[PDB]
Amino acid sequence: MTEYKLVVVGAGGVGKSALTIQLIQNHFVDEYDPTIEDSYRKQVVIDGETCLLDILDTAGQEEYSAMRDQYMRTGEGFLCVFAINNTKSFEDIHQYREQIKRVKDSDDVPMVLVGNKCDLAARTVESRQAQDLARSYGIPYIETSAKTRQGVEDAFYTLVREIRQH
Numbered sequence: 001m002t003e004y005k006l007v008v009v010g011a012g013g014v015g016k017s018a019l020t021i022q023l024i025q026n027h028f029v030d031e032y033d034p035t036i037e038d039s040y041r042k043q044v045v046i047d048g049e050t051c052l053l054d055i056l057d058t059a060g061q062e063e064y065s066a067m068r069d070q071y072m073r074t075g076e077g078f079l080c081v082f083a084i085n086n087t088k089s090f091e092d093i094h095q096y097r098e099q100i101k102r103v104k105d106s107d108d109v110p111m112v113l114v115g116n117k118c119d120l121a122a123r124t125v126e127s128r129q130a131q132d133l134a135r136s137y138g139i140p141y142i143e144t145s146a147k148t149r150q151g152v153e154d155a156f157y158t159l160v161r162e163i164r165q166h
């Protein structure tokens with residue numbers, strides 16, 4: 001069947017793991033255990049197509065930045081995650097986009113910009129600001145909460161649909 005290689009990237013603590021685990025395992029991870037690099041695989045039906053999602057859950061802790069080139073090489077689509085209550089994490093997105101862009105040598109890499117933790121009220125990144133960033137990359141912006149499940153399937157499925165447009 002069709003395999004889609006997704007890679008989840010973004011600053012430490014933005015909820016990359018919580019998002020992936022919510023998608024794959026249907027529960028919310030409340031505790032914070034920084035990730036080195038984990039893999040998840042699951043067969044799902046997306047728009048009538050039975051396919052395999054191979055998802056790489058990457059490290060946001062900057063001390064592991066050396067591992068980025070490797071995973072950006074293999075991945076087919078990238079979920080670029082920031083947290084809506086973390087302005088620095090939003091600012092950090094460009095550095096992830098730029099590296100993906102360099103590694104793929106393409107201004108046309110399947111990506112989705114994700115504003116996570118939308119269940120929290122301490123918002124410092126307004127939807128419109130993120131929409132604008134995404135528009136500049138030519139990609140969708142989707143808000144999510146790994147806690148409530150809001151937008152979680154939408155984000156990952158949209159990334160699959162972006163890979164399909166390429």
Ligand SMILES: Nc1nc2c(ncn2[C@@H]2O[C@H](COP(=O)(O)OP(=O)(O)NP(=O)(O)O)[C@@H](O)[C@H]2O)c(=O)[nH]1
Binds near residue numbers: 012031059060118145
């Ligand atoms: N309220 C709320 N908390 C969230 C959400 N997503 C993640 N968190 C919380 O934020 C913390 C960090 O989540 P985690 O998924 O570990 O982040 P990460 O981006 O994978 N970190 P790392 O880059 O170090 O691997 C955890 O306490 C988790 O419960 C969300 O949507 N809402």
Ligand SMILES: [Ca+2]
Binds near residue numbers: 027028029030
């Ligand atoms: Ca829990």
Ligand SMILES: [Ca+2]
Binds near residue numbers: 139
């Ligand atoms: Ca682009």
Ligand SMILES: [Mg+2]
Binds near residue numbers: 034
């Ligand atoms: Mg993690």
Ligand SMILES: [Mg+2]
Binds near residue numbers: 124
């Ligand atoms: Mg502001």
